[PDB]
Nucleic acid binder design. Structure first.
Lengths: 246, 178, 193
DNA sequence: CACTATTTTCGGCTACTATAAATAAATGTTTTTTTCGTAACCCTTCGTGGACATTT
DNA sequence: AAATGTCCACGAAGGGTTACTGAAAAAAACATTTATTTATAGTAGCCGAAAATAGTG
């Protein structure tokens, strides 16, 4: 009875967590008992809340988890364990507090009181998203925020690449790695997207599908001469405006 | 109250439709059933000014507890922190109300408690240890060693956390190059 | 503001909530709102409980009318102490410069006790004898720092004493909501003046 | 008639209830922004004939 | 050179259609509670003893 369960979860511990298990291999793995008694101890082990019911698509599938985090969730009462189960089932991308309220039928107070107790027990952290901001996304402490950075100081590096070319795309990477650049990740896919910005300002030019020249706007940096045209603007009536015809 | 399954001869290893979700009321229902059933007469729920308020009635003090009090007030100066546990289900507030009480009725024994600044009749050595026999352990450093265990368990957690931080950095770089 | 309109549309449901309950007629709810409205602007509603300020605001309007309603009939619905809601009443009146005010006249409370007490159909002689007892109680020296509902809860005991056997010290306490032994002290007091 | 006994009563014990000050910090509690019926008649469709180009 | 197929356009026919008798969160603001402590008086639970008279044999 219980000794065969000690042999059952050894097989669940035998393989590293991936390559998820199912019965048609597990019956060939363990066939000392007939299926009239194989199912009974697994349903007893569902009552010992160590085996879970994973879904591989359209068909029947199992997964056995670690015991060290099984007693972690058995500390909770069944409602706190109910919200905990969905919030690890997302795992890699997080869950929204409206979606975690819909799938459980728990109304607005009883879910907001549930996770507030769960956060003190160090079992949920709160991150804000960038693909949709102003939305509360929760995760575990696995720290998987798969969702460069949206806040400014983009152009603080684009002045560096434009001073670099003005003297006259793979070479562009290694100039950025030096010179105390506050960076964390460079790739040619990014630097092309970093280069298309100054294509639109006409501060550099695209030639031969990868080469880049200066458009000589350095001489404008220093009729098409839009500085050194200072207006009168004071006590003058006959001045030309761009609006005020619409 | 976990998920249950069954062995159908037609569909083997099938999952049942009803235990998929829980009612959350049937376990509340049986809790209610062995409760007292009272027929309300409108004169029972009478309320006055002494209703929905603080406080209770303290048990009037005994001469047995006087010799546990004045000796605690002769050795210590006036230390209500440890007298509160000496009287196991009495509280910090009414022993302070007893302190102001005994000033007015017996104004001379609080002087004798103040005047005596010396070892008394040395019978309190058992009463020294009568407090010290409950859960005998060296609290001066036994509080330290399990607190050391508390930060030792935390020192596991960042190691379990920060190695879980670096597994994110290797996978999210791998699909970038892919 | 829209948020300032929305904080009184909600606060209009509160005053109509208790006035439907205590049978406050509709010319007091509308009179009560301006007392809430001036206390709204002068930074009195911030911090304190919403449901704790509106009953204290309503009692100002019920005192000015000189009506039979006490203060503890507000608090017993709210299941707090009398002294909790009474303390935020004192910080309303002296802060917001309410100088003129009616006194808690105990002769008002005799006429309203009888109707839900369900006494005999000769309900005038229990009243005509009682206010003449209260006028006798008025010149005599017992109620000056005592309770308006207290001394008016033992007169109608003694006025109905000589005619009925309604005195059992429990059906009158279920009306007056003042303790059983604090009116026997009143009956011991006036006997010996 | 003797005392038992709930009733009647004294009685004191207790415990805040306001009223003014020091912080100081913790706590909750509630607003103001910041954001997520007949009859024309246009309309729509099925359709039929004209000419152009390749091919016999 | 002619004959057939194909591309195109226009009227023919019915089709339907229109005025007729809010909540959520965040920074903001702020009273409350906690800690005294010092007098007074009533409200009240509360026992509690204890006076006392109602009452049992």
């Amino acid at each position: 009875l219980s000794d065969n369960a000690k042999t059952l979860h050894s097989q669940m511990m035998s393989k590293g967590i991936g390559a998820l298990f199912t019965q048609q291999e597990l019956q060939k793995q363990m066939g000392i008992g007939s299926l009239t008694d194989l199912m009974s101890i697994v349903q007893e082990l569902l009552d010992k809340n160590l085996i879970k019911l994973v879904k591989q698509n359209d068909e029947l599938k199992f997964q056995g988890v670690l015991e060290s985090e099984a007693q972690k969730k058995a500390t909770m009462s069944a409602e706190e364990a109910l919200v905990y189960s969905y919030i690890e089932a997302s795992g890699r991308e997080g869950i929204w507090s409206k979606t975690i309220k819909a799938r459980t039928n728990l109304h607005q107070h009883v879910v907001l009181k549930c996770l507030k107790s769960l956060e003190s027990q160090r079992y949920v952290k709160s991150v804000k998203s960038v693909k949709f901001p102003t939305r509360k996304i929760y995760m575990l402490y696995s720290l998987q925020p798969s969702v460069e950075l949206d806040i400014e100081f983009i152009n603080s590096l684009l002045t560096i690449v434009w001073r670099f070319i003005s003297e006259n795309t793979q070479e562009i990477l290694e100039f950025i790695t030096a010179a105390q650049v506050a960076n964390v990740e460079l790739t040619p896919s990014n630097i092309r997207s970093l280069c298309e910005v100054l294509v639109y300002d006409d501060k550099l030019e695209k030639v031969t599908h990868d080469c880049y020249r200066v458009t000589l706007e350095s001489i404008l940096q220093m009729i098409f001469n839009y500085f050194k045209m200072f207006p009168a603007s004071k006590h003058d009536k006959e001045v030309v405006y761009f609006d005020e015809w619409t | 109250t976990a998920i249950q399954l069954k062995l159908n001869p037609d569909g083997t290893m099938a999952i049942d439709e009803e235990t998929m979700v829980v009612d959350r009321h049937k376990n509340a229902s049986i809790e209610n059933e062995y409760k007292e059933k009272v027929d309300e007469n409108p004169f029972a729920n009478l309320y006055n000014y002494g209703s929905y308020g603080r406080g209770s009635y303290t048990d009037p003090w005994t001469v047995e507890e006087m010799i546990k009090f004045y000796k605690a007030l002769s050795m210590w100066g006036t230390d209500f922190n440890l007298i509160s546990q000496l009287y196991p289900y009495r509280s910090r507030k009414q022993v302070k109300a007893k302190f102001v009480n005994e000033e007015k009725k017996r104004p001379i024994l609080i002087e004798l408690a103040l005047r005596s600044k010396l070892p008394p009749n040395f019978d309190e050595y058992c009463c020294e240890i009568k407090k010290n026999i409950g859960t005998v352990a060296d609290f001066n450093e036994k509080l330290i060693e399990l607190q050391n265990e508390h930060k030792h368990h935390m020192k596991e957690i960042e190691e379990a956390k920060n190695t879980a931080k670096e597994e994110d950095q290797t996978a999210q770089r791998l699909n970038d190059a892919n | 503001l829209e948020s300032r309109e929305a904080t009184l549309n909600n606060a209009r449901r509160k005053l109509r909530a208790v006035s439907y309950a205590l049978h406050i007629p509709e010319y007091i709810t509308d009179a009560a709102f301006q007392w809430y409205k001036l206390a709204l602007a002068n930074n009195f509603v911030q911090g304190r409980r919403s449901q704790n300020v509106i009953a204290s605001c309503l009692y100002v309007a019920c005192r000015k009318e000189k009506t039979h309603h006490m203060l503890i009939d507000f608090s017993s619905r709210l299941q707090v102490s009398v002294y909790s809601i009474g303390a935020t009443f004192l910080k309303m009146v002296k802060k917001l410069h309410i100088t003129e005010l009616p006194l808690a006249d105990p002769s008002l409370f005799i006429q309203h006790f009888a109707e839900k007490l369900d006494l005999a159909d000769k309900k005038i002689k229990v009243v005509k004898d009682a206010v003449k007892l209260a006028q006798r109680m008025s010149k005599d020296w017992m109620f000056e720092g005592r309770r308006p509902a207290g001394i008016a809860g033992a007169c109608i005991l003694l006025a109905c004493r000589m005619n009925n056997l309604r005195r059992t010290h429990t059906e009158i306490v279920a009306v007056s909501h003042v303790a059983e032994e604090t009116l026997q002290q009143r009956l011991n007091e006036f006997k010996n003046t």
